[PDB]
Amino acid sequence: MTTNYIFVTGGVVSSLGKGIAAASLAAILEARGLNVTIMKLDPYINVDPGTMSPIQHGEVFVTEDGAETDLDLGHYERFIRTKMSRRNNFTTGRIYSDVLRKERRGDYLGATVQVIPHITNAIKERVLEGGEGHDVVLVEIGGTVGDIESLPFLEAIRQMAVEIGREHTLFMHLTLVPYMAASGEVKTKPTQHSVKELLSIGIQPDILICRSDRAVPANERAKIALFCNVPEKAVISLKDVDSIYKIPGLLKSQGLDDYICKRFSLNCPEANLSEWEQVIFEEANPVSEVTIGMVGKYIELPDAYKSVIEALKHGGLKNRVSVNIKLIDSQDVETRGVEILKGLDAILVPGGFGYRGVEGMITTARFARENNIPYLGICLGMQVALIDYARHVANMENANSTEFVPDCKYPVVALITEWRDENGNVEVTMRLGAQQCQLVDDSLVRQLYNAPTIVERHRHRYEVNNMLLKQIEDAGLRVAGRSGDDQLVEIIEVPNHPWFVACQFHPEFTSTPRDGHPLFAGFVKAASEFQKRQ
């Protein structure tokens, strides 16, 4: 049991799919019975993505231990079974924070603290912490080789390779081999210049992953093999694909996992990708089609809802339904009205913070409730469902969250500390990661999950006000799930409806293409049944 490291770097351009490639290779190695994990080194100065806005960087992924991480850890969990944690993602910001704090504690004992060895040591420690206890660890280095921002990471992993040796380390380098119409060929010159930059910081690549908008022919792979001084079988073609689920198969067909198993002296059986073959087959052969509207406030960057979009596609796979996801701005509902929600087979309202676009989401939940259009609300999606039912069925005028209108008459959503009733009477912190939720018997979700208890991941501050709940319950709404000693509301259902479910937790973070998700499967099934009735 000696841990092996595959360092995954990128050259020429940023957007090579380093994460997908690492995840896809991990999927193959896992399918050979190996204990594998992946970690992402981000060269940004942000301590973590907690502060980073959804419409700049994309969604904040949440691990079961409650870490706020890069959305790439979503790819990782959707390609391998090994659970991600805080240890599988860190930034330059985290590393400098670690070192600045170690300096205050006087751990450096009056020494001058330097990029080498102090910053590089801190990086190596975190890679080893995340890596050890595994057969193979894939380490994705963010950025493009040659840029300033990744130089400490590259020096760190260069040092690791010298210490551990070439028997238990590989350098896998993604590169752009672009097509020029003028020459009618793909061009290796960018790979030549990129590999030279890599050599100049003391890294020799073992494996070249050649990204292009078409196949990189054997002739160009042979050229790249010579000038990089690697075997031709270590030069892999990875053309643009219509589905990332095909990538493990494409890499296996070129023997990449065989090459890695030989270099690391791992005797393991052939990769069984039958689950991926099944996923590819399902995706290629949908029986029917549905249009599902996603109504939120961050649609200007789709990656803001990355895991939700994937969870809907997984819902499609399990029902053999093709899902046409229509991203709709909730502010457009406020101004233009509910005319833009017409022609939808189902409606999803995903998570969010701040009041901008929330009123449109409340109107959207009303439209879906009154017109019997299948509805799934996630976090904020549950809040607007509760506000709708409180306002329009329990006749609680201007019911809202304390997040949006702090001094509202009926704060049906509020922090536990803010909980008050309509007269101002009282009783007597971000919830993050995995928590057990108890499901109410005879509820739709109890049926779908087929268990009394489930584990789903949170990222929210504002809870359902239990002081105003019974009034909403008596007006017809049903509590389907609860959690903890405070008996916090986790899931609500509207029963006089074909399919209406809203949850506080983020089920999208537990959905995979191979195992799907009970809520998303149920939701997409309802969308199909609705479409058939029209």
Place this chain on the structure above:
Amino acid sequence: MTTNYIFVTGGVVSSLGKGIAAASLAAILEARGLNVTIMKLDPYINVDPGTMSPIQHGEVFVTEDGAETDLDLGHYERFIRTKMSRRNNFTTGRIYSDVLRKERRGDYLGATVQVIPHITNAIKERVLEGGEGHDVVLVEIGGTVGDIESLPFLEAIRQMAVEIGREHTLFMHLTLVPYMAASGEVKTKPTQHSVKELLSIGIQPDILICRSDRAVPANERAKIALFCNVPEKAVISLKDVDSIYKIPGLLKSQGLDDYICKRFSLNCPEANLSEWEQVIFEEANPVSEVTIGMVGKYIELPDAYKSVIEALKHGGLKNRVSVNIKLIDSQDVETRGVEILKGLDAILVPGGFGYRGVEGMITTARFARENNIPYLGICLGMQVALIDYARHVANMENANSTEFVPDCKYPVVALITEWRDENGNVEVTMRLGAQQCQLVDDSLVRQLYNAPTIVERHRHRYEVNNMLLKQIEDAGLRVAGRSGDDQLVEIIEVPNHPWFVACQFHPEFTSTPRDGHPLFAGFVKAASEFQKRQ
């Protein structure tokens, strides 16, 4: 009034004297009536030198505003009259701290924080903050061009030069032009390779400062001029010198200040270096010689006492005395005895923290007191003087500091909060920077300073215990200076002695070669008078 910047970089090796060169050039420009200042950008991760050990990095310099800074700010204050502050020195550590904290306050508004532009912006802001309000600002970049650690600094100052323009910015690059016996010539090839590294990060030097162990001939300067595409008058020879006081004259004689005044369109009169000429003359023509023992715990790196060594040399200049400074380990006095203090014309005990070597310093103060050898104690040097006089004249057995022996019977030195008497009765934070001190009339120091009040700089925690003082005063010791509402003891004198003075403050930080220092002048005079009597 448009502020001009001279960016001072170094190539080939670290130890080119970038600070001395910057300070020496500043001295010339100041002697032309210009408002000039200097700042040091350090690529270490240490938030500031406060934590850095004296026997690794050298002395912690203290500005009047109480900043703990690089010893280079000592060079700056000894070459120009412009006072240094916190703004004239910052590290990579400070810059990352600034940015990490701005991220928490949400000043970046959900943006991805990047080396460019966020780290480079933070660097530019601090350079502008320290620079603006001056005719010429010299910005010393620590490190060697081509190293990772200085890349953000070099990108920052490259950006500044583009924005401000070539009319108000210059790049001054120090380089090594070494002599090879084999070729019998100095070699420009290192300068060629260094300048290429500079070009590759988008900086073209305006001025080449050629360091060698001998003159760089016109022939080699002409070669460097062509391959750097600068005028030959912008290629300066700076050979190894026996005295740094000569460097302003050597640079002026090659027209460097004329070149800078033309490039910045500054019409100012010829530099009057008559004060530097006087310093050089004094240093070259000492009338007599003295041996002064410096007894401390950090002698293994002389730079630990950099400003004290310079202050003694300045004492020599003002008395026309050559001072032979003998660095003596205080632990050698503890083991080998006072035999190693023989042949000294005077004794100095400088500042320090921790008990290691303190007992030797107490014995050293006793030797100097009993044998009438001129004594100067600085900070710890005053503590061991008080402990000596308390133990051996006031018969206070085992009198000590609470820093060294917390539960001692007579804590003659302690924190204000720890102040107790011998029976345990009571009454009823690092002191940093400039503080007014009141001088007692008929004291030696009142005579030397010739003023009732002085301003000197502190760097100490532990004070003289005023509860045990009167007992030491009545045993003959005299309080010569005090400060503040707590009437803290700043200066003590033993009067039955030719010259015995010890101060809490660090007078070495206010000494210059041009103006000297009253205490050091008096001390070195006493050392000469003692030597004549033997």
Place this chain on the structure above:
Amino acid sequence: MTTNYIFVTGGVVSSLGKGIAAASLAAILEARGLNVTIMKLDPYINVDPGTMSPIQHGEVFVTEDGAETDLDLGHYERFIRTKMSRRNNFTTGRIYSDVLRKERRGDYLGATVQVIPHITNAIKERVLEGGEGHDVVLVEIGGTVGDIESLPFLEAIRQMAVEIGREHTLFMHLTLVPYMAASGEVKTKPTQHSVKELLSIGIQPDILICRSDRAVPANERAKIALFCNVPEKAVISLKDVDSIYKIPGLLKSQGLDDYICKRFSLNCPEANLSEWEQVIFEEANPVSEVTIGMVGKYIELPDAYKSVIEALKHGGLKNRVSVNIKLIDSQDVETRGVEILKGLDAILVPGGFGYRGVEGMITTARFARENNIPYLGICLGMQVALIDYARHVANMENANSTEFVPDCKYPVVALITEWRDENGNVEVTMRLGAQQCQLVDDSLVRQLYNAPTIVERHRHRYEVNNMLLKQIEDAGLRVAGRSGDDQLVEIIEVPNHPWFVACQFHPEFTSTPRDGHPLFAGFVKAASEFQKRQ
């Protein structure tokens, strides 16, 4: 067995002694019974040094096959017994000539001829041609790594290392580790930046040879070992020495030959350096001293007479005489007269072309003959001796060479085709390399060489005119050596003299420190005997 290659490169500066170090290592390896050779790759565009002026490049060394080569091949032959040929030296000029010629002969079959692979292939072919059939081949790359001029050489040897493998190739990189008074240490930073330059062109050094004006301490070699990822025993200190004969011993004492033999899996006995120890002992323990004047037209650059200066030193070793070589400009004899030839124990006039300073050499030959000062003339040195004698003893007025005065009455020196007598009556180009010479009985040289025939190396056009020889022989001059069918004069003597010999050939090219040379041994012995008589 498989031929092993040591590629010898240089960083930081040109003048590291790459040739001396390669030659000194070859001497250690030859002493271990290995078959070793050395070759020099010069990045100049000159087809060969035959065109290059001696005051620009230094001496044109001549191999036994008549090749005009770099003076480094003189170092090679003075350290190893392996004979150099045309194959042991080529330039970029030769490589481009090779390729341009092959192109016109249609050898490339209408292909585009490129730096890679056509120029690099031509370099590799010539390195193999000189190397194959030896145990170890040392390949010296001229220039400084990072310069444009050496990039094709470095790419060629990089390719060879990939093909041949790490089992039979080593990269030995010389670097400058300069001392700084400011730091009181030698600086590894230039080696750091030079090695980064090597890595960027795809070469990893195996051995670092650290040049400095002093020993590079264990601490500094340890830093270099870590940065370069080489073992500490592969980092060698080579300080400046008084004698190059010590360098084999300094390298052996640090185990360099052991490391090379281990890497190449050569089992050979320990080196016995007794021959070098003896040379060092002889050099360190002279018995008497002499001053020998070398009177020529190229003294501006001493390396113009590299092999002659070394031959005189070797003559010193054999006689236990310390030789003070005084370089005298022959043009100074024309202006200031024979005043400057005073206090010389012997006179040597070396080789040269063109009339400038020749009349000064004729005056010098006359001075030495008339005042019985031991004389050795080489090539031009023989011409001026023959001219002196013809003019001043045989009374042949204005006797000269057709090279200098084509239409002179008495062309005593002239081309074979030009041979005429005083009346203009006739009979019915460059000589290069080793030729047999027949020595005359009862001549001084017949005794000294102790053989009837000798082999010496030529580089000359103009011969002794046989049509005017008889007349000069009748006047007392003796012919001591002849060659070929034309019976060309090789050696002349003046018997009415303690020691007066002059030869057409260059005896300095067959002199070594271990074996010496009979002519130079005799010349220095005569200079000693003359000094004792004064």
